[PDB]
């Protein structure tokens, strides 16, 4: 009984930044995310399950969404997306489309376009009920360099504040 | 070294697509599963993936075109190769200055 | 002629259609030899401007 | 379901499922010497 | 002219159709390796799935089980889980669908032959103590005692009994298709048991009593059964040495189960005939 | 069976450019289209069936359509068209009307009129379902001379593109 206060809900494997190490290519150092294997005292490895929200954000940013219908067409196998979206019930798509920007001159317009796309795609974190106020701060024009820091606002696993305007996220058990 | 198809066949397919698609569009990069697909080449897939990824990057760096299978169909199971990096074999300038002006094969047609 | 060395047979497995008791062996007995070296483009095509030259 | 066949190789892409014979009581060879109580195998019979 | 091959209706002539082209790929095709690597195609595409899906190598361990080759630069992802799911799937197909499709046909059943015999209600004539006297004075498996013969239940070796039951089931399935009772159809029915009925008489009979027929062996080997999906049925011998199996001495030197089953079937087929022997001869391999 | 794919639909004869050869008249060399007879190994000639779309375009351009009602009227037998149009079910007319332009001064205006008429007529190629993107580039004024380059966008006999705005037209078996 009284023990109750701890959800029996668990978390599955989570993709993590720099799980497979950096990859230098003389332009900089990338992250190459993947799955982190946590070892034990006596063999018995196990996949890690931390940073759930960042895991969803990586799953969203780093997967191509469906392309838009053009008169040119697409190769049967290049039109992006996931067939598993045919079975979900929330009536949404899976992935992002930052890599589908219609490039143009005057890189300020390209920056604004990428901002719009990244924000529209990351809003699915709030729509799923995992964060509350995800937001981006994409600001640069350089030659082509761009910085795109992302903030994923979260909660705790026990409602400690009374009288909020919104409504507790539906999945505040991941701790966001 | 273990390419199934005779090489000049796929070379001709690549050259023909490049010559025939960029007639009035001289900026179109011939690369990708749509714009750089060689429909006239059909290979059965292989247990090892030819160029390992390390060699793929090695060739990318040294101004070499690389073709790979489009769909992952499994062993056997006919497929079709497509082109990455529609680039020329240009990596240094006349005075030995690393450049990327004439790297993209579209930059050359644009200069013309 | 030295660019055919990956023949893809159907004889040494259990596909549903397979003459049982037959085997194949590849060889490359002889080999290639000297190639043409034309070096005469100036004469054959000189002011005859092309767009793409494919070499086989 | 086509499988490859390189020049010198054998069909089926490169992998060998092994062998693992594991013989036991040795076969009689005239060159080697035997003592009392030793075992040989000849014609599939143990002696 | 035509050259006729035996059939369920005497000696019909046969032919061959043209190779059409369409025949779904069957069990033989499925392999863990050919569809472990295939399942990697079910994942999405993008910078998170491109490299891992390109570096997906697969090898075979000792006990089949096409696994992924963890070279010392791996990157744990879901791609290897997809290899795992594909491999499983091939395994469960080969252990769940290939049997229960192999067992539904009397001409391919391997592990369910006794069940098929229980379906076909097959009863042996030589094994009951209340056997008919016209079945011989002492059947090959009966030993003598002061008060009559005594049948001895034989426990054939597992492989031999498997092959024998399979042959019996094939012949019973063919007989259930309603043959006409001439000699060619009878011989075609009992052919899987490797036994042929051949008359003794030459002159037009039909005026003499005793129209008898001897049984003659057509081979010393049952065609066996292969549990696998690619190969050839391994043949087994169709006979038993009495001394090796350590049976009583009065029995025959070599006991043939196929011969006894064939004799049962033919003596049941031609029962309505009023005058017919069947002279059994001891046949050594 | 698996070797199925071959549309059992065939193509009838087609009118072809320069089938009957050019006809020099000192102003230039025209085409004189007709029917091409293909010979065989042993006699046995046969009418060719290549280039279907251009054949339809010729049958459209080189056939006078019904003229418009005037106040004076037409001779009973000069009013253009084809009686066979009384039986088709698509409710359309057969032929073109570029030979019925009300000629005027300022040949730029006659150019615009011929453009309108030829484009209206050749839209029937898309309407019947044989092309998709017909278009002309009539551009000259000279003394009277005019060029009228015509493009007939086609498709192939196998849908190799996915995610189109339009649709596989109707008759992509002619190869267009």
TrEMBL record, chain B:
Signal peptide: none annotated. It comes from the Viruses. This is Tail sheath protein. It comes from Agrobacterium phage Milano.
UniProtKB/TrEMBL annotation, chain D:
Signal peptide: none annotated. This is Tail fiber protein. The chain holds residues 3 to 49 of 587 of the full protein. The lineage of its organism: Viruses, Duplodnaviria, Heunggongvirae, Uroviricota, Caudoviricetes. It comes from the Viruses.
TrEMBL record, chain E:
Disulfide bonds join 33-66, 125-264, 212-277. It comes from Agrobacterium phage Milano. This is Virion-associated protein.
């Amino acid at each position: 009984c009284t023990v109750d206060v701890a959800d029996r809900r668990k978390r599955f494997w989570t993709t993590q930044i720099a799980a497979c190490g950096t990859s230098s290519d003389d332009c900089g150092d990338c992250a190459r995310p993947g799955l982190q294997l946590m070892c034990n005292g006596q063999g018995q490895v196990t996949v890690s399950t931390d940073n759930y929200a960042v895991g969803l954000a990586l799953n969203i940013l780093l997967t191509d969404a469906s392309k838009a219908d053009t008169g040119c067409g697409w190769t049967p196998g290049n039109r992006g997306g996931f067939w598993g979206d045919s079975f979900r019930s929330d009536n949404l798509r899976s992935g992002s489309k930052i890599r589908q920007v219609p490039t143009r001159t005057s890189m300020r317009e390209t920056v604004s376009l990428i901002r719009a796309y990244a924000l529209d795609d990351l809003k699915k974190l709030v729509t799923y009920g995992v964060a509350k106020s995800v937001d981006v701060d994409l600001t640069y024009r350089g030659s082509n360099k761009i910085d795109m820091t992302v903030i994923i606002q979260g909660v705790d696993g026990n409602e400690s504040r009374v009288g909020l305007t919104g409504e507790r996220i539906s999945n505040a058990w991941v701790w966001s | 070294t273990t390419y199934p198809v005779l090489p000049y066949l796929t070379n001709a397919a690549y050259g023909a697509l490049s010559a025939c698609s960029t007639c009035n569009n001289p900026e179109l990069n011939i690369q990708g599963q749509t714009f750089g697909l060689l429909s006239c080449i059909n290979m059965p897939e292989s247990c090892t993936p030819g160029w390992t990824f390390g060699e793929v990057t090695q060739l990318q760096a040294n101004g070499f075109v690389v073709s790979g299978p489009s769909t992952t169909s499994g062993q056997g199971n006919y497929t079709s190769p497509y082109i990455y990096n529609d680039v020329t074999n240009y990596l240094r300038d006349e005075k030995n200055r690393p450049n990327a002006t004439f790297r993209d094969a579209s930059s050359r047609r644009l200069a013309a | 002629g030295n660019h055919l060395s990956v023949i893809y047979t159907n004889l040494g497995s259990c596909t549903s259609v397979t003459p049982e008791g037959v085997t194949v062996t590849f060889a490359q007995t002889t080999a290639g030899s000297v190639n043409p070296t034309p070096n005469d483009y100036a004469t054959v095509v000189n002011e005859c401007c092309f767009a793409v030259y494919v070499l086989s | 379901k086509l499988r490859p066949l390189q020049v010198g190789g054998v069909p089926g892409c490169a992998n060998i499922p092994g062998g693992e014979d594991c013989q036991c009581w040795p076969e009689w060879t005239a060159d080697n010497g035997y003592f009392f109580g030793d075992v040989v195998q000849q014609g599939g019979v143990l002696y | 002219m035509n050259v006729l091959i035996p059939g369920i209706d005497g000696m019909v002539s046969a032919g061959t159709l043209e190779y059409t082209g369409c025949c779904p790929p069957s069990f033989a095709d499925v392999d863990e390796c050919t569809l472990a690597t295939a399942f990697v195609g079910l994942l999405p595409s993008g910078p998170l799935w491109d490299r891992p899906k390109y570096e997906a190598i697969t090898t075979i361990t000792e006990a089949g089980n096409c696994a992924a080759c963890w070279t010392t630069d791996h990157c744990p992802t879901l791609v290897d889980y997809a290899v795992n799911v594909g491999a499983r799937l091939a395994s469960v197909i080969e252990r769940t669908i290939w049997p229960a499709v192999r067992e539904s046909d009397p001409f391919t059943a391997v592990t369910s032959t006794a069940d098929w015999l229980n379906r076909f209600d097959w009863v042996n004539c030589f094994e009951t103590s209340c056997r008919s006297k016209e079945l011989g004075e002492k059947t090959p498996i009966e030993y003598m005692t002061d008060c009559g013969p005594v049948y001895v239940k034989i426990t054939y070796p597992p492989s031999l009994q498997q092959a024998f039951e399979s042959a019996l089931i094939k012949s019973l399935e063919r007989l259930s298709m309603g043959i006409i009772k001439n000699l060619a159809a009878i011989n075609f029915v009992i052919e899987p048991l490797k036994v042929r009925v051949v008359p003794v008489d030459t002159t037009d009979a039909c005026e003499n009593e005793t129209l008898c027929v001897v049984l003659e062996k057509t081979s010393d080997f049952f065609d066996g059964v292969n549990a696998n999906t690619c190969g050839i049925p391994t043949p087994v011998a169709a006979y038993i040495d009495r001394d090796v199996m350590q049976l009583p001495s009065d029995l025959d030197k070599y006991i043939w189960p196929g011969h006894m089953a064939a004799e049962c079937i033919v003596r049941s087929l031609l029962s309505h005939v009023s005058r017919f022997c069947l002279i059994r001869t001891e046949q050594a391999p």
